């Protein structure tokens, strides 16, 4: 059987579709940051890292890259000088919108070999397996 092998395949297959149907340039974590900042403009970097579940070094790297692409701006907080506020640029908003449409299409294509009834089973079974393993 080999369910460890199968789980890695499933995750890799999703990563492959992200790269072919969403973007070869914007990664999933980068998009999550744009997404968090659409919902909460001006959120500080530390909190943005928390929203998307990234450590301080990875969020620093993501923010630097999005900054260099002109997709977000970073301002030192006027009040607390040792936090930085992040805000999307006009182009960052545009990129977030375009990618969102592609992501929705991509995930529909990912699940498309399954009939609607099977997709619900797919989620149920995988959730039960992941939940039980993480519950020890």
Closest separation in Å from C-beta 80 to a copy of itself = 32
Cβ atoms within 10 Å, residue 106: 19
Residues near a copy of itself (CB under 8 A): 1-4, 6-14, 16-18, 20, 28, 107, 109-114, 118-119, 121-123, 125-134, 136
Write the CA distances from 11 to 56, 77, 81, 135, integer angstroms. 24, 38, 40, 21
Tell whether residue 2 is among the known ligand binding residues. yes
Q: Which is nearer to a copy of itself, 75 or 129 (CB)?
A: 129
Q: What are the residues facing 76 on neighbouring strands?
A: 84
14 among the known binding-site residues?
yes
Which is closer to a copy of itself, CB of 13 or CB of 75? 13
The CA-based angle 69-40-72, given to 5 degrees, is: 10
Residue 28 assigned as binding residue: yes
CB of 79 to a copy of itself, least distance (A): 34
Q: Is residue 96 annotated as involved in ligand binding?
A: no
> Both tokens of residue 50?
């928390």
């Amino acid at each position: 059987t080999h369910p460890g092998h199968l789980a890695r395949r499933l995750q890799q297959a999703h990563y492959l579709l992200w790269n072919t149907m969403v973007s070869e340039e914007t990664t999933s974590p980068q998009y999550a940051v744009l997404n968090a900042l659409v919902a909460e403009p001006g959120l500080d970097q530390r909190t943005v890292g928390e929203r998307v579940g990234l450590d301080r070094s990875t969020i620093a790297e993501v923010v630097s890259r999005l900054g260099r692409r002109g997709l977000l701006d970073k301002v030192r907080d006027p009040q607390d000088g040792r936090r930085s506020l992040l805000r999307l640029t006009d182009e960052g908003l545009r990129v977030h919108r375009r990618l969102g449409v592609r992501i929705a299409r991509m995930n529909q294509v990912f699940l498309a070999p399954l009939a609607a009834d099977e997709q619900a089973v797919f989620f149920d079974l995988i959730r039960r397996v992941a939940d039980a393993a993480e519950g020890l």
